[PDB]
Amino acid sequence: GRAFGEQLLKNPLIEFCDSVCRGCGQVMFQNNTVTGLLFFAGIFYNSTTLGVCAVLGTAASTLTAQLLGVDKPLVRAGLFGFNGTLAGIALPFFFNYEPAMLGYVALNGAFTTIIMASLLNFLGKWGVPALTAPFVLATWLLMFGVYKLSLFHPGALIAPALPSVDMGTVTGRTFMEGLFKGVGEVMFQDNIVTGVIFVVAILVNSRISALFAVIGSLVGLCTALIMHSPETPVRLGLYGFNSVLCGIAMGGIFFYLNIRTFLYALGCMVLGAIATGAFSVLLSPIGMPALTWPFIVVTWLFLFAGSMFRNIAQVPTEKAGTPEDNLRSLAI
Amino acid sequence: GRAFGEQLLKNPLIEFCDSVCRGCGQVMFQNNTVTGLLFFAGIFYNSTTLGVCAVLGTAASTLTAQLLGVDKPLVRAGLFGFNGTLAGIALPFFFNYEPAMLGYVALNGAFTTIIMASLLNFLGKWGVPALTAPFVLATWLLMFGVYKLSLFHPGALIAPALPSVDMGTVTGRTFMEGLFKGVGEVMFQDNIVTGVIFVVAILVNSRISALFAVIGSLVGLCTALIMHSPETPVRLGLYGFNSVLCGIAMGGIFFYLNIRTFLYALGCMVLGAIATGAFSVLLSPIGMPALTWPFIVVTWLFLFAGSMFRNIAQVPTEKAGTPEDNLRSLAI
Amino acid sequence: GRAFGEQLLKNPLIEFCDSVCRGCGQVMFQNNTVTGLLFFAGIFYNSTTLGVCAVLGTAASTLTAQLLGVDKPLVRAGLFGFNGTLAGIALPFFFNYEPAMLGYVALNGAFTTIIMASLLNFLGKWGVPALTAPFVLATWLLMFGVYKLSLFHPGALIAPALPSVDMGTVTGRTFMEGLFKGVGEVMFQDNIVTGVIFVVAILVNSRISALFAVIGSLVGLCTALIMHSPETPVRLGLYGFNSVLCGIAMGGIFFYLNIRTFLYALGCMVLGAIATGAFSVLLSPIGMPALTWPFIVVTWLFLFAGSMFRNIAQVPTEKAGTPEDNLRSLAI
Ligand SMILES: [Au+]
Ligand SMILES: [Au+]
Ligand SMILES: [Au+]
Ligand SMILES: [Au+]
Ligand SMILES: [Au+]
Ligand SMILES: [Au+]
Ligand SMILES: [Au+]
Ligand SMILES: [Au+]
Ligand SMILES: [Au+]
Ligand SMILES: [Au+]
Ligand SMILES: [Au+]
Ligand SMILES: [Au+]
Ligand SMILES: [Au+]
Ligand SMILES: [Au+]
Ligand SMILES: [Au+]
Ligand SMILES: [Au+]
Ligand SMILES: [Au+]
Ligand SMILES: [Au+]
Ligand SMILES: [Au+]
Ligand SMILES: [Au+]
Ligand SMILES: [Au+]
Ligand SMILES: [Au+]
Ligand SMILES: [Au+]
Ligand SMILES: [Au+]
Ligand SMILES: [Au+]
Ligand SMILES: [Au+]
Ligand SMILES: [Au+]
């Protein structure tokens, strides 16, 4: 809603950085520069090394899109940044440092941009978004081969084992830590304050999305408890973060918020937590993380199914903004 | 072909139950109330607990479709029941009882309805049916995570191991038991009589489909023997049931029955048995069943390939009825 | 460019054999009879048994296409041969001999033709080629089940293990052997001379494709070295062969060759080598080879992404010939 003359003040660098910050915001579907800026602040609050590498990943993917000539509106909306943000954080989260790390992060970010284009072309025929599939698929391709290609060394989170069947103790701590690390863990941030920062950041762009961030973390948490997860992963928000994404996407962004789409959102948040155990098990023989594949698979299923259900009012993806903006234009 | 005035006697409950029974019939592509009714009778004959849970699964998926507002013809044809029937049986077949079982069955049935809608939207662009993919994908998502989410405990069929290379003895028993449990095992019914009941049930709607049920079970059985499976899985019909589905689908339902489409059907039944060993191995490191993924993958490949082969006359999916009805309308 | 009267000399057998040889040529995207003939000569040079089985596989897939009535131009272009060529070689490469081998090769070749049709129907909606996906998917389905179906016995290359983290010594030999076996290994030919023969064969149809065959082998090799692969797989060309295919496909066939599409090709060749470690690890718990899945997945991603990138000029697939013919018709 800004004065059109402000366009005279633009230059490639500042346009690039605005694209980078919107890119970061889009990790949680928030097309907002200030939201991306506060996401970065939250990460930097936890780890300077992770923040630099988030920025580098978002920059590499955004630049690659511009180099290949993606349509300017797609780039300006940060749709070619968010997968690069995650691609940048995931690598130093899971693998030990080597000098090559920064080069591999740039590569991983560049690759997300290819796959983002692939999936917009593939999925666009049904009006379905790519979500974080570009980040997951690129990262898996760059991570899985580490046992055969030793440049990097995996961290202690990466331990191949056949799955098998202690339980810990649920406390108030499980809930307060689970809630906010569930949000933080969307960006691999094992930090309660970063998690609060993340909610505040979404709140700047959209209050409804901030609430669904909170709801999803909670529904993921207690679904995992009802399903008898040990407490440790729950407290750590490992069953919240896919459900956070599920909540934000289904909660008024890709569907017009009402009672019915709310209940539909809830089914998707519950199944996202259950799919988290499923995919963790699937990849355990090779020791690899499922990342946000749970959110992606379950949310894709609910998105594809939308147009078949008369009682569930989808938002056309090309139009889809904040939940509030969505309801404002429906009522016009 | 019923008197149009019979519509005055309808009420939501009886329409629902007719949808449930057609739903059960569609497990084997039979849109017939009496066929579904006799499928239920066959299951109840084997296990009252499995029959109640088949009914509950079909009911949960059907109701969920109606709640979300699926187009009435899709629901009335039982297309939103059959995956719910399987989702209901599979869970108590593979996992030990807990009070939560019935809730998890309802959830699994509700989820099949989402995925059914997803796949009708996705695959419909090529006129290709969803088959039992909704049941397999939902069930895998609810089953795989059991090692991490302990509410349920897996039965002794579920045992993670890396695959490796005794053989038993083929007898007349291998054949008579293999044949009818091959049919029974389409619905997880380790019972010869249930298997005979199932054939009779299909016979009510379509004789050609009843024959292809029998052929597929046999082709799966002897393919497995030619390929040197140990006898035990063969006798148990574990190499028949994907081939039963392959036979029924390819045998005059999705292709007009003639000599060429017959031979095409046979190739699909053989490869369905071979794909059964393939997918059993693929999932063995996590101890999980492939269910009807073998049938689904191989039958999808033959369905997608149909429109490229001039010598193989596909039935448009929107039209596709019994093999007999298919040939009757081709000749008009 | 041949005299139209030469058509009077045609008969089904000679048309079939021309289709078989073009089929073999298409293993490396070369629609050329002489190229296929010299590919066969290269294989026969290494192993008579592998050459007969390449021929039998190409013949089985081609005949099956003709039996099912594939559009004559598709068959005449060898598009229904190349996956059959690979399907024929892969089985005796990985599994020990049994009398049944030839029957299983014919079956595997017939199956590639189904999947080729499937994928032309599926992918054709985006103008994207099937590549060697028919060969990989058919072969996996026929190979994975070997632990459960003992007709064949796997060779010592097939050894299920959970992955885990010696290095050898890089020499001039690593490079000269790596380069040419990288080309040879596109067809499972552990032979330096066969590899040289293969380059010469491509050179007959297209010099640019021959260069990209060489470049891809090299980029795969040194990517693997930069990524700290042990030397043994590198010397053996196991990190070249997916990158060879990547290079040939991206190097002027599916994209008009220029500086930008060259750099795009390079990104695809690098990621093909990295995806080779990834997929080798993914299948290691079941002991199975990834074959050309690395090339297929990475090249599909770059192909699908092409139409989104204004700076990257795709060749419409229906038109796509040699790099030289591609530039000749662009300039008209
Ligand atoms: Au910025
Ligand atoms: Au800035
Ligand atoms: Au900025
Ligand atoms: Au900013
Ligand atoms: Au958005
Ligand atoms: Au960094
Ligand atoms: Au870093
Ligand atoms: Au709870
Ligand atoms: Au709760
Ligand atoms: Au009923
Ligand atoms: Au009833
Ligand atoms: Au009824
Ligand atoms: Au009934
Ligand atoms: Au039907
Ligand atoms: Au029950
Ligand atoms: Au039950
Ligand atoms: Au037999
Ligand atoms: Au037989
Ligand atoms: Au020939
Ligand atoms: Au010839
Ligand atoms: Au010839
Ligand atoms: Au020839
Ligand atoms: Au071609
Ligand atoms: Au041979
Ligand atoms: Au052979
Ligand atoms: Au190098
Ligand atoms: Au190099």
Side-chain angles (χ1 to χ4, degrees):
Chain A
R2 290 273 248 161
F4 282 92
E6 293 201 1
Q7 126 142 338
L8 296 179
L9 304 166
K10 299 181 201 151
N11 65 278
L13 202 28
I14 207 60
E15 272 214 282
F16 183 88
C17 179
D18 186 271
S19 290
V20 166
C21 288
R22 284 171 193 280
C24 188
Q26 291 273 31
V27 169
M28 293 203 230
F29 309 94
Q30 309 304 303
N31 185 0
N32 192 296
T33 297
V34 169
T35 298
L37 189 66
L38 290 171
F39 279 169
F40 285 135
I43 298 157
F44 270 95
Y45 173 83
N46 180 44
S47 163
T48 294
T49 298
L50 293 186
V52 166
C53 267
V55 174
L56 171 67
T58 314
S61 73
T62 306
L63 180 67
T64 301
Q66 297 182 247
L67 283 171
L68 299 164
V70 171
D71 293 344
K72 199 179 177 168
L74 268 21
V75 173
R76 259 175 115 184
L79 293 171
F80 282 79
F82 67 101
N83 289 289
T85 314
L86 297 170
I89 306 149
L91 288 173
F93 187 79
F94 286 108
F95 286 176
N96 301 329
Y97 182 79
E98 270 104 349
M101 179 66 81
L102 277 30
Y104 214 50
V105 159
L107 179 58
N108 201 13
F111 197 14
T112 66
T113 275
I114 307 301
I115 306 189
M116 182 54 120
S118 305
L119 288 179
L120 290 168
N121 187 23
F122 181 76
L123 295 175
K125 311 317 194 66
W126 298 265
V128 165
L131 310 175
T132 52
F135 154 68
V136 168
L137 293 171
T139 303
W140 282 347
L141 288 170
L142 302 212
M143 284 182 64
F144 283 5
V146 73
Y147 307 103
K148 286 195 87 82
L149 301 173
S150 271
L151 179 63
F152 302 96
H153 293 102
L157 286 185
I158 283 163
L162 297 181
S164 56
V165 179
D166 217 13
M167 291 298 292
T169 315
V170 179
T171 54
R173 194 212 182 196
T174 315
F175 289 99
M176 306 289 245
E177 191 168 327
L179 163 53
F180 294 108
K181 295 193 171 175
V183 179
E185 277 291 352
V186 170
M187 303 200 215
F188 311 100
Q189 307 296 304
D190 173 51
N191 193 307
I192 287 176
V193 180
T194 302
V196 175
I197 289 163
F198 280 6
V199 172
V200 166
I202 298 155
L203 182 66
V204 166
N205 191 39
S206 170
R207 183 216 261 277
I208 303 169
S209 279
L211 218 92
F212 275 88
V214 168
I215 295 170
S217 189
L218 265 147
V219 166
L221 197 156
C222 253
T223 291
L225 293 179
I226 291 164
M227 299 301 296
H228 289 16
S229 174
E231 191 268 347
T232 291
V234 179
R235 179 186 49 87
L236 293 165
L238 300 179
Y239 282 99
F241 69 96
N242 288 290
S243 287
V244 167
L245 291 178
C246 292
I248 296 169
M250 304 295 295
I253 296 185
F254 297 112
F255 295 91
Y256 293 108
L257 184 74
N258 56 55
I259 184 71
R260 296 167 301 289
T261 59
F262 172 68
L263 291 171
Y264 197 66
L266 225 37
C268 179
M269 297 180 235
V270 169
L271 290 165
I274 287 151
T276 296
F279 287 119
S280 166
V281 162
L282 187 64
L283 291 180
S284 56
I286 66 164
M288 288 291 163
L291 306 175
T292 47
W293 200 244
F295 147 67
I296 290 154
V297 158
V298 176
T299 310
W300 275 350
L301 292 162
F302 282 68
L303 286 163
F304 267 100
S307 57
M308 300 297 291
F309 300 144
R310 306 194 203 206
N311 290 337
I312 280 134
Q314 280 234 231
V315 188
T317 295
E318 168 131 38
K319 297 190 185 302
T322 63
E324 293 85 352
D325 297 319
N326 285 349
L327 292 174
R328 271 177 166 99
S329 81
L330 182 85
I332 303 174
Chain B
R2 290 273 248 161
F4 282 92
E6 293 201 1
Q7 126 142 338
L8 296 179
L9 304 166
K10 299 181 201 151
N11 65 278
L13 202 28
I14 207 60
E15 272 214 282
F16 183 88
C17 179
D18 186 271
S19 290
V20 166
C21 288
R22 284 171 193 280
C24 188
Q26 291 273 31
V27 169
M28 293 203 230
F29 309 94
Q30 309 304 303
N31 185 0
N32 192 296
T33 297
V34 169
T35 298
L37 190 66
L38 290 171
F39 279 169
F40 285 135
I43 298 157
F44 270 95
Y45 173 83
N46 180 44
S47 163
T48 294
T49 298
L50 293 186
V52 166
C53 267
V55 174
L56 171 67
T58 314
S61 73
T62 306
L63 180 67
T64 301
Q66 297 182 247
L67 283 171
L68 299 164
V70 171
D71 293 344
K72 199 179 177 168
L74 268 21
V75 173
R76 259 175 115 184
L79 293 171
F80 282 79
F82 67 101
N83 289 289
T85 314
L86 297 170
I89 306 149
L91 288 173
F93 187 79
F94 286 108
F95 286 176
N96 301 329
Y97 182 79
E98 270 104 349
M101 179 66 81
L102 277 30
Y104 214 50
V105 159
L107 179 58
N108 201 13
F111 197 14
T112 66
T113 275
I114 307 301
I115 306 189
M116 182 54 120
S118 305
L119 288 179
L120 290 168
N121 187 23
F122 181 76
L123 295 175
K125 311 317 194 66
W126 298 265
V128 165
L131 310 175
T132 52
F135 154 68
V136 168
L137 293 171
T139 303
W140 282 347
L141 288 170
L142 302 212
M143 284 182 64
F144 283 5
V146 73
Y147 307 103
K148 286 195 87 82
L149 301 173
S150 271
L151 179 63
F152 302 96
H153 293 102
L157 286 185
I158 283 163
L162 297 181
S164 56
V165 179
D166 217 13
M167 291 298 292
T169 315
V170 179
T171 54
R173 194 212 182 196
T174 315
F175 289 99
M176 306 289 245
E177 191 168 327
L179 163 53
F180 294 108
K181 295 193 171 175
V183 179
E185 277 291 352
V186 170
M187 303 200 215
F188 311 100
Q189 307 296 304
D190 173 51
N191 193 307
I192 287 176
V193 180
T194 302
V196 175
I197 289 163
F198 280 6
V199 172
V200 166
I202 298 155
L203 182 66
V204 166
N205 191 39
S206 170
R207 183 216 261 277
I208 303 169
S209 279
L211 218 92
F212 275 88
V214 168
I215 295 170
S217 189
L218 265 147
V219 166
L221 197 156
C222 253
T223 291
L225 293 179
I226 291 164
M227 299 301 296
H228 289 16
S229 174
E231 191 268 347
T232 291
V234 179
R235 179 186 49 87
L236 293 165
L238 300 179
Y239 282 99
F241 69 96
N242 288 290
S243 287
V244 167
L245 291 178
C246 292
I248 296 169
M250 304 295 295
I253 296 185
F254 297 112
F255 295 91
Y256 293 108
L257 184 74
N258 56 55
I259 184 71
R260 296 167 301 289
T261 59
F262 172 68
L263 291 171
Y264 197 66
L266 225 37
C268 179
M269 297 180 235
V270 169
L271 290 165
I274 287 151
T276 296
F279 287 119
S280 166
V281 162
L282 187 64
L283 291 180
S284 56
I286 66 164
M288 288 291 163
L291 306 175
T292 47
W293 200 244
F295 147 67
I296 290 154
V297 158
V298 176
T299 310
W300 275 350
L301 292 162
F302 282 68
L303 286 163
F304 267 100
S307 57
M308 300 297 291
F309 300 144
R310 306 194 203 206
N311 290 337
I312 280 134
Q314 280 234 231
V315 188
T317 295
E318 168 131 38
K319 297 190 185 302
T322 63
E324 293 85 352
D325 297 319
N326 285 349
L327 292 174
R328 271 177 166 99
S329 81
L330 182 84
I332 303 174
Chain C
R2 290 273 248 161
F4 282 92
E6 293 201 1
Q7 126 142 338
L8 296 179
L9 304 166
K10 299 181 201 151
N11 65 278
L13 202 28
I14 207 60
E15 272 214 282
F16 183 88
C17 179
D18 186 271
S19 290
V20 166
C21 288
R22 284 171 193 280
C24 188
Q26 291 273 31
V27 169
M28 293 203 230
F29 309 94
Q30 309 304 303
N31 185 0
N32 192 296
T33 297
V34 169
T35 298
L37 190 66
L38 290 171
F39 279 169
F40 285 135
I43 298 157
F44 270 95
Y45 173 83
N46 180 44
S47 163
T48 294
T49 298
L50 293 186
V52 166
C53 267
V55 174
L56 171 67
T58 314
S61 73
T62 306
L63 180 67
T64 301
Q66 297 182 247
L67 283 171
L68 299 164
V70 171
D71 293 344
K72 199 179 177 168
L74 268 21
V75 173
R76 259 175 115 184
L79 293 171
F80 282 79
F82 67 101
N83 289 289
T85 314
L86 297 170
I89 306 149
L91 288 173
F93 187 79
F94 286 108
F95 286 176
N96 301 329
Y97 182 79
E98 270 104 349
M101 179 66 81
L102 277 30
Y104 214 50
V105 159
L107 179 58
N108 201 13
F111 197 14
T112 66
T113 275
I114 307 301
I115 306 189
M116 182 54 120
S118 305
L119 288 179
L120 290 168
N121 187 23
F122 181 76
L123 295 175
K125 311 317 194 66
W126 298 265
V128 165
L131 310 175
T132 52
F135 154 68
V136 168
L137 293 171
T139 303
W140 282 347
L141 288 170
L142 302 212
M143 284 182 64
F144 283 5
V146 73
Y147 307 103
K148 286 195 87 82
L149 301 173
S150 271
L151 179 63
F152 302 96
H153 293 102
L157 286 185
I158 283 163
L162 297 181
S164 56
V165 179
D166 217 13
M167 291 298 292
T169 315
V170 179
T171 54
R173 194 212 182 196
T174 315
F175 289 99
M176 306 289 245
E177 191 168 327
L179 163 53
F180 294 108
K181 295 193 171 175
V183 179
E185 277 291 352
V186 170
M187 303 200 215
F188 311 100
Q189 307 296 304
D190 173 51
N191 193 307
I192 287 176
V193 180
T194 302
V196 175
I197 289 163
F198 280 6
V199 172
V200 166
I202 298 155
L203 182 66
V204 166
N205 191 39
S206 170
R207 183 216 261 277
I208 303 169
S209 279
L211 218 92
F212 275 88
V214 168
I215 295 170
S217 189
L218 265 147
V219 166
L221 197 156
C222 253
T223 291
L225 293 179
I226 291 164
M227 299 301 296
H228 289 16
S229 174
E231 191 268 347
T232 291
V234 179
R235 179 186 49 87
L236 293 165
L238 300 179
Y239 282 99
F241 69 96
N242 288 290
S243 287
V244 167
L245 291 178
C246 292
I248 296 169
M250 304 295 295
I253 296 185
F254 297 112
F255 295 91
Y256 293 108
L257 184 74
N258 56 55
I259 184 71
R260 296 167 301 289
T261 59
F262 172 68
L263 291 171
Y264 197 66
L266 225 37
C268 179
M269 297 180 235
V270 169
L271 290 165
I274 287 151
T276 296
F279 287 119
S280 166
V281 162
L282 187 64
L283 291 180
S284 56
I286 66 164
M288 288 291 163
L291 306 175
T292 47
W293 200 244
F295 147 67
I296 290 154
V297 158
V298 176
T299 310
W300 275 350
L301 292 162
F302 282 68
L303 286 163
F304 267 100
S307 57
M308 300 297 291
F309 300 144
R310 306 194 203 206
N311 290 337
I312 280 134
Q314 280 234 231
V315 188
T317 295
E318 168 131 38
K319 297 190 185 302
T322 63
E324 293 85 352
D325 297 319
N326 285 349
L327 292 174
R328 271 177 166 99
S329 81
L330 182 84
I332 303 174

